Amino acid sequence: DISTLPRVKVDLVKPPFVHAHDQVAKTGPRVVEFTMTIEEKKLVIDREGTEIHAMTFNGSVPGPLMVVHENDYVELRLINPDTNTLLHNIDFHAATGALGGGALTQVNPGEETTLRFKATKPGVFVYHCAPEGMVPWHVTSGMNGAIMVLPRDGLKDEKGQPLTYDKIYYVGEQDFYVPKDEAGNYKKYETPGEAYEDAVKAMRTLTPTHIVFNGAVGALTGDHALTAAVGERVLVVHSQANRDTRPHLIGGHGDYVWATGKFRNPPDLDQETWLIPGGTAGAAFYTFRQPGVYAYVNHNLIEAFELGAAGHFKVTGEWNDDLMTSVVKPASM
Amino acid sequence: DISTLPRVKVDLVKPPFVHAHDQVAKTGPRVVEFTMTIEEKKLVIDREGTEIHAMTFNGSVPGPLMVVHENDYVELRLINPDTNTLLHNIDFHAATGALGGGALTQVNPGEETTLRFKATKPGVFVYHCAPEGMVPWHVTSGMNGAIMVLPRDGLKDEKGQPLTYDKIYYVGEQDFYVPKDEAGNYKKYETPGEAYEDAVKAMRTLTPTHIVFNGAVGALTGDHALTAAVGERVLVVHSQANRDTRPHLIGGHGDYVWATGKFRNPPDLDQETWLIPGGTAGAAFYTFRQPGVYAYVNHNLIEAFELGAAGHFKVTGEWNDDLMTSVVKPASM
Amino acid sequence: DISTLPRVKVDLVKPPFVHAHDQVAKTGPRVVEFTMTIEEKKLVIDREGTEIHAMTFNGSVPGPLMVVHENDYVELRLINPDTNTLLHNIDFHAATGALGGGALTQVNPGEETTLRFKATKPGVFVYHCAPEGMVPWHVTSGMNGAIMVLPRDGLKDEKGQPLTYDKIYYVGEQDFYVPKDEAGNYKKYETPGEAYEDAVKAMRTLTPTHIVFNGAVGALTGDHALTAAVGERVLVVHSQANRDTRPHLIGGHGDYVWATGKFRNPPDLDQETWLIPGGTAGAAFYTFRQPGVYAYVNHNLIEAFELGAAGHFKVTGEWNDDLMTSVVKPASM
Numbered sequence: 001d002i003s004t005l006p007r008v009k010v011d012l013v014k015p016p017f018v019h020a021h022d023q024v025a026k027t028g029p030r031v032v033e034f035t036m037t038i039e040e041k042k043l044v045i046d047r048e049g050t051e052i053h054a055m056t057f058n059g060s061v062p063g064p065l066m067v068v069h070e071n072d073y074v075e076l077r078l079i080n081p082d083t084n085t086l087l088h089n090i091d092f093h094a095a096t097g098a099l100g101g102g103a104l105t106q107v108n109p110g111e112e113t114t115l116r117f118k119a120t121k122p123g124v125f126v127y128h129c130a131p132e133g134m135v136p137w138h139v140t141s142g143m144n145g146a147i148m149v150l151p152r153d154g155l156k157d158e159k160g161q162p163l164t165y166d167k168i169y170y171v172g173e174q175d176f177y178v179p180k181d182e183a184g185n186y187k188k189y190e191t192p193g194e195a196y197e198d199a200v201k202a203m204r205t206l207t208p209t210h211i212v213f214n215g216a217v218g219a220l221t222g223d224h225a226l227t228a229a230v231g232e233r234v235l236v237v238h239s240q241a242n243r244d245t246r247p248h249l250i251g252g253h254g255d256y257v258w259a260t261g262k263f264r265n266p267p268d269l270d271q272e273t274w275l276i277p278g279g280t281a282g283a284a285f286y287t288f289r290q291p292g293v294y295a296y297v298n299h300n301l302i303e304a305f306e307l308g309a310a311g312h313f314k315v316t317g318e319w320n321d322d323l324m325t326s327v328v329k330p331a332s333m
Numbered sequence: 334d335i336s337t338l339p340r341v342k343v344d345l346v347k348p349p350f351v352h353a354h355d356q357v358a359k360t361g362p363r364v365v366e367f368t369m370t371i372e373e374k375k376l377v378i379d380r381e382g383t384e385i386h387a388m389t390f391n392g393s394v395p396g397p398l399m400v401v402h403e404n405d406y407v408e409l410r411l412i413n414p415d416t417n418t419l420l421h422n423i424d425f426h427a428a429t430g431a432l433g434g435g436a437l438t439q440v441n442p443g444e445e446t447t448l449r450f451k452a453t454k455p456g457v458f459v460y461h462c463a464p465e466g467m468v469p470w471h472v473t474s475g476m477n478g479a480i481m482v483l484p485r486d487g488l489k490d491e492k493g494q495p496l497t498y499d500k501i502y503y504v505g506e507q508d509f510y511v512p513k514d515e516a517g518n519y520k521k522y523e524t525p526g527e528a529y530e531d532a533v534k535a536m537r538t539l540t541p542t543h544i545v546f547n548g549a550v551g552a553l554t555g556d557h558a559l560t561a562a563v564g565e566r567v568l569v570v571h572s573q574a575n576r577d578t579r580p581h582l583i584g585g586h587g588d589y590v591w592a593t594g595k596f597r598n599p600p601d602l603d604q605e606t607w608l609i610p611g612g613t614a615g616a617a618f619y620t621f622r623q624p625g626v627y628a629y630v631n632h633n634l635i636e637a638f639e640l641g642a643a644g645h646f647k648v649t650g651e652w653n654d655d656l657m658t659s660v661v662k663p664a665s666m
Numbered sequence: 667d668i669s670t671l672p673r674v675k676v677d678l679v680k681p682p683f684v685h686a687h688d689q690v691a692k693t694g695p696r697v698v699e700f701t702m703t704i705e706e707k708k709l710v711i712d713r714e715g716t717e718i719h720a721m722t723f724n725g726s727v728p729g730p731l732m733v734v735h736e737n738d739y740v741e742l743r744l745i746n747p748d749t750n751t752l753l754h755n756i757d758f759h760a761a762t763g764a765l766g767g768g769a770l771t772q773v774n775p776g777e778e779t780t781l782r783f784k785a786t787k788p789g790v791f792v793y794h795c796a797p798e799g800m801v802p803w804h805v806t807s808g809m810n811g812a813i814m815v816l817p818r819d820g821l822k823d824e825k826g827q828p829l830t831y832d833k834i835y836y837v838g839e840q841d842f843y844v845p846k847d848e849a850g851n852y853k854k855y856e857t858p859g860e861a862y863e864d865a866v867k868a869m870r871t872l873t874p875t876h877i878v879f880n881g882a883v884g885a886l887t888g889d890h891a892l893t894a895a896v897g898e899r900v901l902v903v904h905s906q907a908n909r910d911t912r913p914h915l916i917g918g919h920g921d922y923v924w925a926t927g928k929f930r931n932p933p934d935l936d937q938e939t940w941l942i943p944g945g946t947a948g949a950a951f952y953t954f955r956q957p958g959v960y961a962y963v964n965h966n967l968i969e970a971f972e973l974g975a976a977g978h979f980k981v982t983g984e985w986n987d988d989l990m991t992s993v994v995k996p997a998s999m
């Protein structure tokens with residue numbers, strides 16, 4: 001049966017960008033092949049130079065977004081090079097059995113493996129490393145990403161009518177727990193292993209020291225802001241592998257939102273803010289109607305503005321005064 | 334086009350009360366005019382006299398509830414008197430563009446401005462102050478409220494049938510982060526500015542010192558309890574601009590609930606408790622069936638009973654033994 | 667009217683098991699009689715011997731699951747033996763009036779009472795002790811459980827078609843706040859009363875020291891894992907009386923999920939993880955398709971793996987390679 005299926009190899013792209021794919025499937029079920037390389041690396045997460053030993057899928061935090069269609073087979077080649085120091089694996093929330101694949105993918109530095117699973121349910125799902133006994137430690141070190149399983153006929157609105165996006169972005173939100181000295185200064189370590197004992201005590205406080213988009217404070221800002229034009233339909237996938245978040249587009253809305261990200265359910269309309277539970281990926285669809293800068297944030301504003309959970313959208317186009325206008329500009333009175 | 338529209342000025346009322354309005358629109362689209370005055374003031378929040386420098390819209394925490402209909406134009410005159418010390422603005426989650434209006438409404442002490450926006454989506458939304466760089470500080474100092482955009486044909490149930498409330502109340506929930514000394518005593522400051530540096534360090538712990546309804550511990554109790562009679566249909570709007578809450582009416586239910594508050598979606602039925610994400614306003618509709626006192630609470634009971642997130646309903650009427658009865662009153666055995 | 671109704675006494679079973687009942691009602695409305703005995707007892711909650719003074723309904727944490735049908739009358743005899751030291755009561759979220767029954771059920775050591783209420787709404791609900799002034803203290807000491815009110819025609823899917831489970835399990839999740847000394851060691855007390863003053867200060871930090879299933883770290887593991895076979899339809903009821911949780915079955919899904927647990931609403935499909943708000947009971951229905959061990963967890967992985975919110979499912983049957991297979995087992999390369 002599988003022997004007879006067509007196969008296509010797909011090369012992944014770095015978040016927030018997403019690899020080329022078709023929304024509506026033009027071919028029948030296939031075996032979609034991906035290759036990921038694990039990379040343990042030092043990463044600077046804020047403006048003051050705080051450094052951590054990130055554990056990554058393909059060198060990025062979050063790991064890249066994989067896109068397939070319902071009933072396709074995902075075939076993953078996972079490589080853990082001998083330059084790493086720890087055992088890693090991968091658990092797909094999109095998959096059925098063997099702890100999401102985690103029990104079949106344990107690779108020590110110098111090993112590789114290939115797992116295949118059938119994508120039987122449509123929706124956006126989280127995938128993350130989950131080694132027996134060090135689970136929260138690898139996840140909160142940035143070792144998580146997401147896979148999107150599209151219905152073969154693409155997205156549909158509350159009424160069964162087609163929804164087609166023009167642009168798609170992947171925002172992976174990460175909660176970090178950096179150990180601190182008595183005064184509150186962040187600690188630095190030589191290897192991932194040296195940090196372990198302190199990492200555990202920092203996580204048990206349940207209070208993140210940083211909560212960021214795309215791996216660092218300000219990663220999605222300035223020259224890195226997400227871009228769009230008035231009139232474009234944008235799909236924004238957002239994942240949080242460990243902790244709850246409440247995304248919100250300032251100056252905009254979630255016209256159609258699957259907060260818990262499963263496409264067999266109808267979307268919620270006109271959301272101001274939506275809750276994505278820790279361990280879940282969600283998707284929001286919006287059509288831009290006004291140009292300018294928009295801030296995309298986790299709506300606990302302390303987590304957004306003090307901790308790092310803020311990004312930008314820079315949108316081009318003509319201003320519409322019907323929707324909004326300054327009748328009297330700020331003046332003395 | 335707007336030139337030709339009828340206009341009506343509306344005078345706001347203090348929470349938990351709501352200004353007079355029609356559920357079902359009897360007129361066509363209009364320009365609804367509101368005036369809000371910013372007031373920075375000291376506020377005592379608990380029984381022991383803890384004081385803070387509240388930043389308010391119209392002198393209350395939360396700011397008043399505005400009520401309009403879908404496709405009406407909201408025209409707001411915002412005044413920041415010279416007696417204030419800080420720059421303020423306003424971002425409406427109900428609006429499209431310019432950061433919810435925040436980028437068009439920056440007023441220093443002594444200034445005013447008038448913003449107009451079209452209410453294109455029906456639902457209850459949060460509005461809050463959002464000055465560049467001091468966002469969480471103004472919000473958690475009480476500078477937030479809500480606007481309700483009613484469908485022109487009013488509320489409907491899961492089946493499209495009309496829902497008409499007899500009473501409506503606005504409960505604004507506020508998380509406060511009061512700085513503390515080494516022993517745990519709350520600090521006091523001369524001006525809002527003196528508190529700033531400590532405010533920031535208190536917010537980063539992410540642990541509120543108080544979580545209250547209508548600005549203070551016990552504000553909605555005793556002589557201030559919300560009132561109703563058996564048989565009345567009550568709509569309770571609840572907002573949390575920064576943090577998640579889970580409202581619950583003890584001894585009652587949410588017969589129809591829009592947890593994320595957007596009226597184009599059908600309501601959830603028979604809720605015991607519902608989650609309102611930080612940065613969102615929700616609405617619950619209930620018909621009283623038994624008389625007595627009811628406690629309306631945030632269902633994390635520590636936040637409710639230790640931190641201040643508890644209010645009361647005092648309901649008049651006849652007891653129904655079919656629904657409930659004490660078969661054997663507490664006695665020795 | 668009630669005089670004329672048939673009556674049936676039901677003997678409760680210890681969680682995670684559930685007493686015998688019919689899914690589809692074969693009789694007309696009845697008066698279902700239950701007896702619960704309060705028991706204050708010392709309980710060891712972790713591997714290192716941490717002990718607490720648990721306050722329980724029937725000797726277990728959580729209290730047992732009660733199962734009735736919509737429009738049946740629940741008649742509860744509640745006994746607080748003279749061996750206890752504190753006043754207790756019971757508030758049913760399933761009931762209408764008198765604070766869920768809390769104001770009608772106050773019993774001091776040596777007393778008993780019998781409350782009757784009509785189960786007018788279908789769904790899974792929480793019940794918990796709620797004495798005026800010590801509410802969070804009795805709840806977080808383990809004094810809560812759940813009642814399931816089944817529609818008279820049983821469960822239905824998103825389309826109105828019947829859903830029949832083969833097995834049902836009750837998982838009660840508990841957040842504990844154990845007082846600590848200066849170094850971080852947990853304190854021990856002689857009586858519940860001696861712990862009170864410190865209990866309050868520990869709860870106000872809002873940071874649980876333990877979060878467990880069925881009363882202890884590892885209670886649902888090893889020889890205590892939940893069991894099933896490939897092909898069985900399992901209903902898992904989960905409750906959290908005080909704090910939010912996000913259940914997730916590793917290697918599986920929630921095929922039909924009522925996150926806020928009210929059966930008049932259609933279920934959400936294909937959930938990876940779902941949010942159950944503090945003060946609520948939810949239910950997830952799943953059909954096992956692969957054999958092996960599954961971990962059932964609260965998906966904030968720090969709360970799961972460091973704090974105790976993890977249990978197991980041991981499923982028998984044949985492996986299906988179509989759904990998943992190890993193409994290349996971990997090897998050197």
Ligand SMILES: O=N[O-]
Pocket residue numbers: 248249250251297299301424433463
């Ligand atoms: O929409 N300003 O958080």
Ligand SMILES: O=N[O-]
Pocket residue numbers: 581582583584630632634757766796
């Ligand atoms: O319903 N007592 O939290």
Ligand SMILES: O=N[O-]
Pocket residue numbers: 091100130914915916917963965967
């Ligand atoms: O599905 N491993 O949390």
Ligand SMILES: [Cu+2]
Pocket residue numbers: 055087088089129130131138143
């Ligand atoms: Cu890893």
Ligand SMILES: [Cu+2]
Pocket residue numbers: 091093128279914916
């Ligand atoms: Cu997981």
Ligand SMILES: [Cu+2]
Pocket residue numbers: 388420421422462463464471476
């Ligand atoms: Cu302000």
Ligand SMILES: [Cu+2]
Pocket residue numbers: 248250424426461612
């Ligand atoms: Cu906002």
Ligand SMILES: [Cu+2]
Pocket residue numbers: 721753754755795796797804809
């Ligand atoms: Cu009790």
Ligand SMILES: [Cu+2]
Pocket residue numbers: 581583757759794945
């Ligand atoms: Cu309760």
